[model samples]
Target: NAPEVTTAKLGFIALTDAAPLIIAKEKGFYAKYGMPDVEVLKQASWGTTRDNLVLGSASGGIDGAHILTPMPYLITMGTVTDGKPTPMYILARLNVNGQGIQLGNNYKDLKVGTDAAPLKEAFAKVTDPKVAMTFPGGTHDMWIRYWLAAGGMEPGKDFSTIVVPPAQMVANVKVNAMESFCVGEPWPLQTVNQGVGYQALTTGQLWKDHPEKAFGMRADWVDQNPKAAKALLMAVMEAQQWCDQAENKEEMCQILSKREWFKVPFEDIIDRSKGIYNFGNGQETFEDQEIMQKYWVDNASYPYKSHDQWFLTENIRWGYLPASTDTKAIVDKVNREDLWREAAQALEVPADQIPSSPSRGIETFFDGITFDPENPQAYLDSLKI
Candidate 1:
């Protein structure tokens, strides 16, 4: 007989990737799998979501979370939070990358820079432009830092950076707290729509198929509640499959527009998720398959160890961790592929759908160094800074 799971709780931010949890709860996937009492608690911020899971606050608070890829590494290495490292594990990849770096309208007249060269040019012309991100050691921070460093601009030195919540991104930019930002959609798109900023470049364009969010959990939680953990994965997997359907895109936009979630107008949410992007710098609307979430069945759900290793590498490059750290060892420990395999097998999901090989993509950075995921160390060594 298959294992049985009763009740479970999960946490999510107000972003589009969190749609899987919402759809699972609404579509009754958990109940169908015998986990009849699964609950998803929406949180105010990513920091809150990470804290609850780390502190064991919410009754298995977010048994797992749709989190930024850098989160687990930051937590485990004792870099972001206090030294109490939460033994976190990556269950699955939630989506491919969809982030962008945008410049304020004041810099709109400046010529577009390829990677970091143009960014450095812009910084040289300006005087002490402030930058901002949602979190300091997370994806947004790394993206912003990488773009700046590539352009020969020091993050905390050449320009000032402050932490502003996601919801406040556009507002803060408008009120003068930031001259540029590296953020996830539809905030970047929304800023472009509002004519406050122009899209300099997208993260996907920066690092193609770069890993984004994943389902994260404490390792011990999975140990004690294996059955419940598998059930939750199945439920989320079903929702992810549904989310990738083209016909449901509009409805998904509407569902995520509620006050409890992104709280933005439906039009703004649909524009970006549907790939109807406008750079507001005279570029017409364009469709980007790379921008949307692929959910579960698209081979986008696999958590590759190499991707984890890349994040650890970036952490070291940015001084978040010691250069001597054994990145492979930490990645192997943090990304629980064994547990993910167990969950997939129990749900009759094909193990072959997960890619074992590393993704080779061009990383256009401000510094002119391209990152080859297949040869990360070589890319790191080539950086002039």
Candidate 2:
């Protein structure tokens, strides 16, 4: 069937997880799917991306984005849209496990790796110490909070938290604006290479194969253009598969380093893209392919309802969402994994690639905390903080 529209406007945050959308356009996957005019624009920050999505494409803004997984729910519920609900749909997950945590070189002697206990004393001794994340109630925010709380430090009480754009994270740390931050690839690696900071740990080490960004669009657009939406989903799905292969790794990093994308040196993007993490603390370094940001491996592209449940629970954990919030209802309304399967089947993707259930089952984090999607309250009760 022909697409209802041949063009769509999408926004990305210049992060490595944004590779699928970038690759889909550059490699002609969008054209192959009959959407050659797809525009992948760069958003300066998650806040900017949210503002544009609320504006919609007709108003000179984007129709969708490579976004944080919880954003669709937040936007849909009007929680983060200045209380003006702009219903959104998460069509697919863009990536998993490429983000990281970094600490300014001021604490380099502490050599805080995965264990953040080292920073407790160091952070307490600093004057007006603050840690940064890209957005409030976002993946980076949740990661840093979980990491610190596991190390027995209260985020808002133990040390302050501030918002910074992903691209600006290293710069902020360089000037000692914040002692630490958590954000997606290249920026974390850039901080280490700049000699201003060192990797405390990769988000992958915090929670293996954790879901990160999503391919989300406004519900109005999807509802109005069903065929065109499928085309867009299929195009991104194709690119995700392409990006996962080892042969395309080098070229992918190079393309992402261009001025229009990440706008950084190839060296900064390459090593981490390949899962070669030199933590820069001088005591620990790892080169494991499994640790790299994944686009397709291990069902990374699937938008499991269970993952959304975890995000909602975390939002609850941090008082971002009310405790009585109906997370399942929100997840059911926002998650469009059915669209993902429809697009995958249309593309003739292998049967093995499609998951049988929407749930990924129970997930355990590095701190031995288990989140059973079926019982989020138990997981919530287990947290002491």
| TM-scores of the candidates in the order shown | 0.89, 0.98
Task: Kindly report which residue stretches of model 2 are placed more than 4 angstroms away from their true locations once superposed.
Answer: none
The best candidate in terms of lDDT:
2
Clashes of each: 6, 0
CA lDDT of every candidate: 0.73, 0.91
Q: Work out how many backbone clashes candidate 1 has.
A: 6
**In angstroms, how far off is 76's CA in candidate 2?**
0.6
List the candidate 1 regions with Cα displacement exceeding 4 Å: 1-5, 58-62, 111-116, 124-127, 348-352, 356-376
Roughly what TM-score does model 2 have, to 2 decimal places? 0.98
Error of 2 at 192 (Å): 1.2
Q: Cα-based RMSD of the predictions, in order?
A: 2.8, 0.9
Q: Which one wins on TM-score?
A: 2
Backbone clash pairs for candidate 2 read none
> What is candidate 1's CA lDDT for residue 248?
83
